[PDB]
């Protein structure tokens, strides 16, 4: 691709510069080029990939929600709101397709860290979930099942291989519970998953890691917030 002539280490370096400059589309392009070199990504590099694409798709979701709300209130006079919502929607789907293609073609493997395997399967569940936020037809069922399957496989690994305070395990369970509540229309599943995750992290709080405990305690607070919202 466009990044094929650049050295891997230069791509990582430039992804970090782009983060500093808040140029997240650039930083995602740099990290996509890094992934396409075909070597595994370290934890720090997975964070770069994650931050870039989450920033890009987050702006698209935010835009799509604004336009969709305008579109729904105007359905209570021309084609313009729908066409522009469809435009942003198509771009969002393209970014999710790009991320999911990278996960399938390069990143999701049988080997490697529990951390890496759980994180990428979590990523796959998330980007299927973002596709499901804008899906409607026969696609929507296919996409919702794909999200669940990826989340569930990540959950199985994290529960076997990871302490209950691990921030990837926590963030996965947080995002799966959001899937249950907002996408799958299964509230009770979401409260029970979120409560089980919080309580189990709390019961084994001594497993907090000194290089990540701030991340763990952030996610357990977000679990509590969702539980307070949902109850």
């Amino acid at each position: 691709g466009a990044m094929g002539s650049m050295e891997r280490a230069s791509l990582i370096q430039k992804a970090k510069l782009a983060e500093q400059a808040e140029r997240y589309e650039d930083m995602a392009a740099f990290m996509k080029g890094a992934v396409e070199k075909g070597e595994e990504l370290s934890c720090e590099e997975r964070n770069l990939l994650s931050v870039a694409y989450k920033n890009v798709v987050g702006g698209q979701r935010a835009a799509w929600r604004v336009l969709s709300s305008i579109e729904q209130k105007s359905n209570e006079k021309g084609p313009e709101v729908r066409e522009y919502r469809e435009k942003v929607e198509t771009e969002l789907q393209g970014v999710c397709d790009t991320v999911l293609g990278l996960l399938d073609s390069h990143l999701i493997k049988e080997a490697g860290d529990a951390e890496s395997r759980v994180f990428y399967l979590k990523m796959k569940g998330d980007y299927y979930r973002y596709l499901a936020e804008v899906a409607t037809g026969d696609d929507k069922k296919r996409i919702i099942d794909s999200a669940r399957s990826a989340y569930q496989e990540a959950m199985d690994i994290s529960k076997k291989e990871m302490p209950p305070t691990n921030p990837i395990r926590l963030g996965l369970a947080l995002n799966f519970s959001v899937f249950h509540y907002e996408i799958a229309n299964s509230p009770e599943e979401a409260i029970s998953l979120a409560k089980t995750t919080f309580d189990e992290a709390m019961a084994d709080l001594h497993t907090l890691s000194e290089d990540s405990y701030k991340d763990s305690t952030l996610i357990m607070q977000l679990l509590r917030d969702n539980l307070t919202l949902w109850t």
Partner: peptide
Amino acid sequence: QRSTSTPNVH
């Protein structure tokens, strides 16, 4: 008010 998912960090 929607649910809160995992945020960006670091």
